[PDB]
Every structure is written in structure tokens, then in C-alpha cells.
């Protein structure tokens, strides 16, 4: 006799699967994200954005700012000795 | 027939045969049936090839 007619009706593999709240999260995510950026060092542009750049980008950790601030300081109190003198 | 030398009986056998020769007439009772099967089925075929195209371009 004649086959069943369920197989012909599907609406419960097609909400009934997992990767389905995977898919509504990642064509939010992903679609709605810019492929690239606008720039990663900028922050204090007035030529010390430069300073930024050179120094406290995640491109180095290089001991130069930390060198120039501790110069800065020895500068500071130094001239207040010759100021204090 | 020509076995039997009673024959006159096989003439009569032959003549019921020939004469109920429709054993039994036509059936063809899948034409009201099965075109109302056909249309639920292909709506609801139709309607999750629909769903699952349109999802698999999604």
C-alpha cells in the first residue's frame, strides 16, 4: 500500500538541528564585521602619536620609553637641584 | 474431449467456460484516490524542497 507521506514534510531537521543557533549567532558576527581596522597606535596625535607608534605599539617592547620617562624624571629633580642650589 | 467417451458433458463444460469467458470485468479504481494523495503530497513536497534550497543558499 501506498508509502507514508511524513518524509515529505520537514520543519524539524531543518529548526531541529544544533548548528542552527550557530548559524543565527555567525550571520551576525560574521557579515557584520569589518574585514580590517583603522588604525592600531593614534591615541595622542600631535606628532606623540609618533611617540606611541615607536614605543607602545604590541610591535615591540622595547626598554626606550621606559629609558626616556626614567631620563625625564632624573631630569626633573636634577634641574630642581641646580634650582634648589 | 476426445479422452472422454461420456462427451457430451465436456461440450457442456466447454460451453460454460465459453460462456462465463468474462471470469470478471475491469478494475481501475486508482484515478479518484490517487490524484487526491497527489496533491497533499506534492504540496507538501514541493514545500520542503522550497525551504531547504532557500535555506542551503542562506
Known sequence: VSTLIP???VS?????????????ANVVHFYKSLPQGPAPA????????RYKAKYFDGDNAS??????????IIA????????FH | ???????????????????????????????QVIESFEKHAMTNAKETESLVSKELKD
Not at chain 1, 42 to 49: G, M
Not at chain 1, 76 to 83: L, N, P, Q, V
Not at chain 2, 6 to 29: C, F, G, L
Open chain 1, 7 to 9: 518524509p515529505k514534510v
Open chain 1, 12 to 24: 524539524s531537521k531543518n529548526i531541529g538541528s544544533a548548528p542552527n543557533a550557530k548559524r543565527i
Open chain 1, 42 to 49: 593614534i591615541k595622542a596625535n600631535t606628532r606623540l602619536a
Open chain 1, 63 to 72: 626598554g626606550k620609553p621606559l629609558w626616556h620617562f626614567a631620563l625625564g
Open chain 1, 76 to 83: 626633573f629633580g636634577y634641574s630642581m637641584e641646580y634650582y
Open chain 2, 1 to 31: 474431449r476426445s479422452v472422454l467417451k461420456n462427451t457430451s458433458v465436456i461440450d457442456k463444460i466447454e460451453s460454460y467456460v465459453k460462456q462465463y469467458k468474462p471470469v470478471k470485468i475491469d478494475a481501475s479504481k486508482q484515478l
